[PDB]
Amino acid sequence: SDRVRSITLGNSTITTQECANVVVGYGRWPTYLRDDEATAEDQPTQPDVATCRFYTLDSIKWEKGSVGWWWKFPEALSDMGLFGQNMQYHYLGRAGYTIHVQCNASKFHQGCLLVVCVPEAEMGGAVVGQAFSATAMANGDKAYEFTSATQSDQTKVQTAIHNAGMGVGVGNLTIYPHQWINLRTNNSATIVMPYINSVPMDNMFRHYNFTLMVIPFVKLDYADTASTYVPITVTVAPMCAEYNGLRLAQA
């Protein structure tokens, strides 16, 4: 059967028994930087198994009135194991990712989720002009919620769901690497993202490589059951990570 998948990174394993295929970025698998594309001269460090492993990114509740959530990477892993330490101590970084989203429900539930990775998901403020701090869209592994109505608070991002916070039609996000979680058929989604940027390496604190979004297109529904909510969990594993430019910590 092709509905079973198993993934082994480092000292951690993921098993799914009811799942769809695996989506691989833009057809490219993660890989190390070549000698003819590098620019930095000093030797890189490659922790390997110490950093390339699955980390569980806390959990959220799917209610009948949920609208959606987003996470920004690699900020979401900024304080997670030795990956966070290497991020703190190094000037430059580079790594691909494997994203696994778990959501399971009985055969009597219904609903559909869109899982999509958006590279360079620049967002606009709630009030045209003005400005917002780096806390309205990234504060660690905590998830940020979209809003059904137009946002009004000037201190946070425009969370109107139907625009995806980017001024574009929410229905066109299918162009990015994506997958669907339809409760009739599957309970997980797997995406492999290569490193995408305009430069060989970049500082992992200053720049958000990509944004993960989970959006319920068909809202959850059920009847006459004791289960009131459907938890959603996100797991991420860096791949082929390497760092450069050791200095004092913090960033």
């Binding site: 509905r3 691989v24 833009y26 057809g27 599957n186 492999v192």
Partner: protein, 59 residues
Amino acid sequence: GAQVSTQKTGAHEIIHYTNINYYKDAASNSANRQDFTQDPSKFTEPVKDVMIKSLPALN
């Protein structure tokens, strides 16, 4: 130093044109608007395992 290549078809169908470069910088050349290769698999078929159209998808 002269390139000879075919020109796009037109109504009523020596379908050849001549080109010479005069400047020392490649940025000065004219647009290369005659390449027509394309491959949509990167966006239409990004899955890992190959899927056969005639077979059922999930199992």
